[PDB]
Each structure stands twice: as C-alpha cells, then as structure tokens.
C-alpha cells in the first residue's frame, strides 16, 4: 500500500496500488476543496474519508453506489452499521432475508463480500443535515467513479432521482443500472427489486455470480 501526503489535516492517505493512476490528481483536487471543506463539521471524520482507498479493485465486479454517508454515526464504510439500527442496512437485510431465506441476522457488513465494493458518491456530508458538500466533492466523485467503473463489471446505483443523469456523468456506459433507494422519499416508493439481476447479468458476461451470504455477521 502506497502513501501520499496532502497539505491539510491528516497529512497522510494510504491507498492500494489499484488506485495508482488517479491518486495524485485526487490530491490536486482535494487541497483547494480542503480549504473550505474543514470550515464545517462533517459526519465522517476526515481520517475516515479515504478508508475505502485500501480495498483492491482487481477482484471486484459489482459496485453498489449511494449518494452520501449516514447523517449521524459515520463509520467511513458505506452502508455499514455494526449495531443493526440504520434504516438502509436493516431494510437491505430484510430484503435479502426474504429473497434468500437466511435467518438470525446480527449484521450485514457488505465490505467483506468478495467481488462487491460498497461506494458512496459523496465522501462527506454536513453533520445532522442532508448532502451539503456536492460542490466540493463533485470533481473528486466523478474521478473516483470513473476509476472504479473501469475495473468493475456492473454498477448498481441507489436512488432514481439522484442518479437521473448518471449516464451523462460517465463517458463510458459500463452497464449502468439504477435502482430505487432503500429509504423511499422524493416522489418515490419501492423496496423490492429482487436483488438478483446482478448475478444473472454476471453470468451473462461469462463471470461468476456473487453469493449474497458472505456478508452476514454472527
């Protein structure tokens, strides 16, 4: 794992080799943003902004994408809550329990499933508020999504309204699949997409399907 030094706060970011050809640019984009980004409190601490940079991208084929971290108790890992209380994670656990049949759920950590990387479009948000760092993270988010989509095979974005033009934000349409958010809001109400189109799309491209059982916590 390589390391880089930035001008502001943590002074040290550790990243895997798979993120090599963009990391420098990220710093070139980060410093300016940092000058304003630390002006306000953020739900993720700055030390956990780039925790996901250590995950390799060579053995990943499905990329699940959100819009922002949780407004409170930001762990750094997207869609992660080691207390089974967040709305999105418990809804996803209930859906996967209905679809598969596994019972006795004590956690659904998604970062441990092989071939699936949890990703957040915006790496930070205002504490106790909605997404308020869209202008700051815009170019960084675009760069990171472009880097990720060139390694993974399928992209599954959560939120129809938020990703209404996700195809315009990415020059290469690498299997852009947009799904409804687990938390229904903003003229939307849907919770059951059967969570199985990803696997069949995977063997439609001569790729091994991903089992939705390695993420369970006992």
């Amino acid at each position: 794992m390589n390391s880089v030094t930035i001008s502001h706060a943590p002074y040290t970011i550790t990243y895997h080799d798979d993120w090599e050809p963009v990391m420098s640019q990220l710093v070139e984009f980060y410093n300016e943003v940092a000058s304003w980004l630390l002006r306000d409190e953020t739900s993720p601490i700055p030390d956990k902004f780039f925790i996901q940079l250590k995950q390799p991208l060579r053995n990943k084929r499905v990329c699940v994408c959100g819009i922002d971290p949780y407004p409170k108790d930001g762990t750094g890992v997207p869609f992660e809550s080691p207390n089974f209380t967040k709305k999105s994670i418990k809804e996803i656990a209930s859906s996967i329990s209905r679809l598969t049949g596994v019972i006795d759920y004590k956690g659904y950590n998604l970062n441990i499933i092989d071939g699936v990387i949890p990703w957040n479009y915006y790496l930070s948000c205002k504490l106790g508020e909605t997404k308020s760092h869209a202008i700051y993270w815009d170019k960084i988010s675009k760069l990171l999504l472009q880097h990720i989509t060139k390694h993974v095979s399928v992209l599954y974005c959560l939120g129809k309204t938020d990703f209404s033009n996700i195809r315009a934000k990415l020059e290469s349409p690498v299997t852009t699949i947009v799904g409804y958010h687990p938390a229904a809001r903003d003229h939307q109400f849907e919770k059951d997409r059967s969570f199985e189109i990803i696997n069949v799309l995977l063997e439609l491209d001569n790729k091994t399907p991903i089992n939705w059982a390695q993420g369970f916590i006992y």
């Binding site: 349409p173 690498v174 299997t175 852009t176 699949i177 947009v178 059951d192 997409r193 059967s194 199985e196 189109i197 069949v200 799309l201 439609l204 491209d205 001569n206």
Partner: protein, 426 residues
C-alpha cells in the same frame, strides 16, 4: 421477478445464447433484435453482443475412430447411427439439416402431437432424425439426463424407432475390433442401412464414433434413378456389374455430383458400400453430370426440385390426388365433394390459387418465383390466356426449362382452380 424481471432479464435471450449450437435462423434474428433493444434500455445495458448464423453440433462430438481401437471399461449403450438426413429440433419447429433452415415441413401430425414440448430437461436437445427417405427414426441425443429414461425411452414409448438401445453391463475393458462390431450389428436386428455405431457410457456426453474405412476401388457404369413414390424416389447409382453401392442423395438431389463413369473410391463395412458425397474434390463437375442425368432419364426429373415434371399430365385428376379426395372426372363432382368435405373446403378457401397450383405440380419455390418474375402475361377475366418470356438468362437452368415446358399444364390447372373458386363462392 417483481416487475417481471424484464422477461427474467431476457430469459429467451439467455436460452438462445446457450443454444446457438442447436438453434435456427428465426431465433437468430430474434436474438439479434433482443440484444439490439437490450443494449439501450433503462433496465439493461450493453452485452457480449455475439452473433452466429451457422448451426454446428461438432462441439458435442469427438473424432471418428478408423481402426480397431481399445475401449475403457464400463457399461455401454450402443447406438446404430444410420445414414440419412439428420434433423435437430426440440418441438414442432427447427428440424434443420445442419444449415438448411426450414427447407420443408414434414406432414406428420401424429408425430408432432406425440413429441412433448421440451421433454425431460430441454427436449433431449435434438432428435437426430435420419429420415433415410421418409421414415422417421430417432438417434443419439448427447443430453445427459440419466440415459435409460425418457431420452432413449421415447422411441419405444411412441414407436418412432425400433428398440435397439438395450444392452447389458459390459465392463472388462477389451480391444474393440471387427468381431465385436459385427456382433453388435447382429444384436441390433435392423434392416435399415447403418453407417456407424456410437457407444455411450453412464457419465458422459461426447462419444467417439467408430467407422472402418475399408477403401475399395471400383468403376462406375451408369447413373439411373428408380421411382418409389411421389418424391420417394432415390437416385440409386449402380456401379460395377450392377452393384447396389449406396449413395446419400436424400430427397434433395445434391451430394451426388460425382463424375459419370470413370473410376471411383468407395467405402464398405459389412453389406452396404457407400461412396463419397463431397469430401473428395477431384473434378466435381456439375453441368455435365446434370445434363447426362437429364438425358438418360428422358428430359424429366428436374434436379433442383427433387421431383419429376408432370409431362403429358394435363390435370383434372392430379388436384384430387393432391387434395387426398375421391377420384372425380367432372368439375361438378369436384365442387360437390369439396363442399361435402369438412376440411378440404377450409384448406381451399384459406390458400391461394397460385400456391395451390404450385403445390399440385410440386414446383420448387424459389425457382418458380424467379421464373414467374422474369415473364410477361396477358391476363383476361382473372385467367391466364397468353404468356411469354422476357429474359432468357433464366433458361440456362434446366429445371427452369422443364418448369417452363410444363407451364402450359400449370396454366390449365390454375384456370381450373380459379373457375372452381368462382363457382364455389360466387
């Protein structure tokens, strides 16, 4: 499958993707349209986008054995691979001879009803119907399933094929030689021409077919056809001093484009010598052999249409034979019987006059369409009164020439059917 899963995320597309090896043309265009619309969709994006139009089954087969090889021990099922026009299908469609997509429809309604829609797993994945001339016989299926079950049991259940699929536990690996091959042939107890024996053991899909070359060198005397029935005749070439020498030439008169007379190489195994069809190039002259065949027959039996021209036969009776009704000598009796018949009236009202006459005279489809498209008519009162040729290039084909020769009888029968239709509904 909440929102129909978009047809189970194109279940038919996936089936065609895995079925390219045993698919047909219409499914190929359907799959092309499916991928074209799926690559730009709110619920599906770009796919592998691979296309193919040639039907091949060589992936499920192995190399042919040409010597008394040695076999591994185990239980074996011996399959008498016959010598006929192989057809592959799963239901009342397909039945394509390795590329001849839907050449013609076999009129076996009982067979079509008997065959289950996707029997067992996927309808044994193909039937391997040899159809030597017109007799239906099933063969290997390669599909695993179990083997002593529906796959091989369908022939015994419905009577399509004589039961020759029964064997015993063999084991005790021995060198497969001529003696065992002949013993298995005699144990088959069949009179149909057999060309190969394919062994299947429990736990495999691809079998190594065995065929003894036994290259013989024989001379050709003459090529003569013998009639067995309406499109049931076979151009049985006779070589040497009247030997039988089997030749493929199934229904359609191709693969018999061998040089007349001269010296040839043949293959014989126990009783039925078979020569090459198209493997040995040599000369492969076609114009000379077609002209010699036509001249020997007597200017009849057009090659492309695999049938014989109705020279001299005007009509008024061939319509009855084609419609499978009682023989009649007058138009009034024909009309009365057509009215009385429950289904002949429906079939004559549904079809057109041109199609009815074309099927009555047994003309080829494409050749007759082209010949009509290069002609001029003088239609009067919805009947043909005078016809002429405009382009004489199409006359280069002898089959087109014979069809033009019998076009007079075609016109007479066309007028007769038009008059019958006018007198029936008007």
């Amino acid at each position: 499958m909440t929102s129909s899963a978009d047809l189970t995320n194109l279940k038919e597309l996936l089936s065609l993707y895995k079925s390219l090896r045993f698919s047909d043309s219409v499914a190929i265009e359907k799959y092309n349209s499916l991928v074209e619309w799926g690559t730009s969709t709110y619920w599906k994006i770009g796919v592998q986008k691979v296309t193919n139009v040639e039907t091949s089954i060589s992936d499920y087969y192995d190399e042919v054995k040409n010597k008394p090889f040695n076999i591994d021990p185990g239980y074996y099922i011996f399959l008498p691979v016959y010598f006929g026009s192989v057809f592959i299908y799963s239901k009342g469609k397909n039945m394509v001879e390795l590329g001849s997509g839907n050449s013609f429809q076999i009129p076996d309604e009982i067979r079509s009803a008997c065959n289950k829609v996707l029997d067992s797993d996927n309808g044994i994945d193909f039937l391997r119907f040899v159809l030597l001339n017109n007799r239906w016989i099933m063969e290997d299926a390669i599909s695993k399933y179990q083997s002593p079950v529906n796959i091989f049991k369908l022939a015994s259940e419905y009577g399509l094929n004589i039961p020759n699929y029964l064997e015993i536990e063999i084991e005790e690996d021995t060198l497969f030689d001529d003696e065992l091959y002949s013993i298995m042939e005699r144990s088959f107890d069949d009179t149909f021409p057999k060309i190969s024996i394919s062994y299947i053991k429990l736990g495999e899909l691809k079998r190594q077919v065995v065929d003894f070359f036994k290259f013989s060198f024989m001379y050709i005397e003459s090529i003569k056809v013998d009639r067995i029935g309406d499109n049931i005749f076979i151009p049985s070439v006779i070589t040497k001093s009247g030997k039988k020498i089997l030749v493929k030439d199934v229904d359609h008169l191709i693969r018999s484009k061998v040089r007349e007379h001269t010296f040839v190489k043949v293959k014989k195994k126990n009783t039925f010598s078979i020569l090459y069809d198209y493997d040995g190039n040599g000369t492969e002259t076609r114009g000379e052999v077609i002209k010699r065949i036509i001249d020997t027959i007597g200017r009849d039996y057009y090659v492309n249409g695999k049938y014989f021209s109705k020279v001299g036969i005007a009509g008024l009776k061939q319509l009855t034979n084609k419609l499978d009704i009682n023989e009649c000598a007058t138009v009034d009796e024909l009309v009365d019987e057509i009215n009385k018949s429950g289904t002949v009236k429906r079939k004559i009202k549904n079809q057109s006059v041109f199609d009815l006459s074309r099927e009555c005279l047994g003309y080829p489809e494409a050749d007759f369409i082209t010949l009509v498209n290069n002609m001029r008519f003088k239609i009067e009162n919805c009947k043909v009164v005078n016809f002429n040729i405009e382009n004489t290039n199409c006359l280069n084909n002898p089959s087109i020439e014979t069809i033009y020769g019998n076009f007079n009888q075609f016109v007479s029968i066309f007028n007769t059917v038009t008059d019958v239709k006018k007198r029936l509904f008007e």
